[PDB]
Design a protein around this ligand. Structure first.
Ligand SMILES: CC[C@@H]1C(=O)N(C)c2cnc(Nc3ccc(C(=O)NC4CCN(C)CC4)cc3OC)nc2N1C1CCCC1
Ligand SMILES: CC[C@@H]1C(=O)N(C)c2cnc(Nc3ccc(C(=O)NC4CCN(C)CC4)cc3OC)nc2N1C1CCCC1
Ligand SMILES: CC[C@@H]1C(=O)N(C)c2cnc(Nc3ccc(C(=O)NC4CCN(C)CC4)cc3OC)nc2N1C1CCCC1
Ligand SMILES: CC[C@@H]1C(=O)N(C)c2cnc(Nc3ccc(C(=O)NC4CCN(C)CC4)cc3OC)nc2N1C1CCCC1
Lengths: 128, 120
């Protein structure tokens, strides 16, 4: 029962303590306000930000690194398309991605254990 | 779609800030260790405690007050059966239930809205 809660708990701390701690990362903490910036949402088909990711964590959307990294990489891919590949904002998003992979790698063996246990538990549960 | 996370978050603060705060409530904060007290689990068929309630909350098990109160009332009902109706332990367990309904009622009007939006 503990494993999904623990994994989400770790992800959410990686976000708040490492990713949101990157200098000048504030533009990526919250969604672009669509009421104010409509052109953003005509350009970006799948907008993403760290707050949306935290909401996903709190709902336990991520059961492994891979779908979590999909949304994290999306924050960079969107920045590339809207701000340009050489933008200061994009360089900041690049750093957010790097610190993410750096942190996951530092805890690889622990996260792999959580992922295995989350996945075997869903197997046994549904079987039942 | 914030509503289940919001309802779970409120329940968890009622537990840590109000229920676990009644004096001498510590015996009800964690399970009876079955390795040391086997007679508890031969007498009590559905043992319950605050930490198990918190884990269920973190799993979003409770989608309304009704199933949440079932597990809270279980902690008293178990104490009546094992410790006696008149025990000091049972008296404190009564206060945990009392502060629980007292806190839920104070925010009743906010929680009913959360419950509706969870079902929708
Ligand atoms: C879409 C481009 C890029 C991006 O990729 N993302 C994700 C982004 C997301 N959210 C924001 N948000 C805000 C940006 C600026 C302001 C703000 O208050 N700016 C002041 C306005 C008055 N002016 C005299 C001084 C500056 C408020 C924002 O949200 C409340 N900006 C973002 N930026 C950039 C980061 C700074 C410029 C725009
Ligand atoms: C973006 C995550 C999510 C969400 O969706 N929203 C919108 C949200 C909006 N506001 C909050 N707010 C607070 C969250 C935690 C605390 C807090 O830690 N309080 C302590 C409790 C113990 N006490 C001894 C000391 C103080 C206070 C908050 O506001 C005052 N949390 C939110 N969460 C929650 C956070 C992760 C799970 C859900
Ligand atoms: C009978 C059950 C009843 C109950 O209703 N519940 C739920 C309960 C749950 N958990 C406990 N747990 C522990 C109770 C006492 C101790 C402990 O270390 N006590 C010392 C033992 C030796 N020492 C020299 C003197 C005191 C550790 C416990 O868990 C780590 N006790 C419970 N109690 C009572 C609450 C005080 C007495 C027993
Ligand atoms: C039933 C409780 C449940 C559970 O199932 N278990 C087993 C659990 C075990 N350990 C913890 N531990 C910690 C929980 C919160 C914090 C914390 O708030 N840390 C902040 C991090 C940022 N800052 C540097 C310091 C403040 C630290 C914890 O460990 C030291 N929490 C648990 N939870 C949590 C409750 C819902 C989510 C997870």
């Amino acid at each position: 029962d503990d494993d999904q809660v623990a994994f989400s708990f770790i992800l959410d701390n990686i976000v708040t303590q490492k990713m949101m701690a990157v200098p000048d990362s504030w533009p990526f903490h919250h969604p672009v306000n669509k009421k104010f910036v409509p052109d953003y949402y005509k350009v970006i088909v799948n907008p993403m930000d760290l707050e949306t990711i935290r909401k996903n964590i709190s709902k336990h959307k991520y059961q492994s690194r891979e779908s979590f990294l999909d949304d994290v990489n999306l924050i960079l891919a969107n920045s590339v398309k809207y701000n340009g590949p050489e933008s200061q904002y994009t360089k900041t998003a690049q750093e957010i991605v790097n610190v993410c992979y750096q942190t996951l790698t530092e805890y690889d063996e622990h996260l792999t254990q959580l992922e295995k246990d989350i996945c075997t538990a869903k197997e046994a549960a549904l079987e039942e």
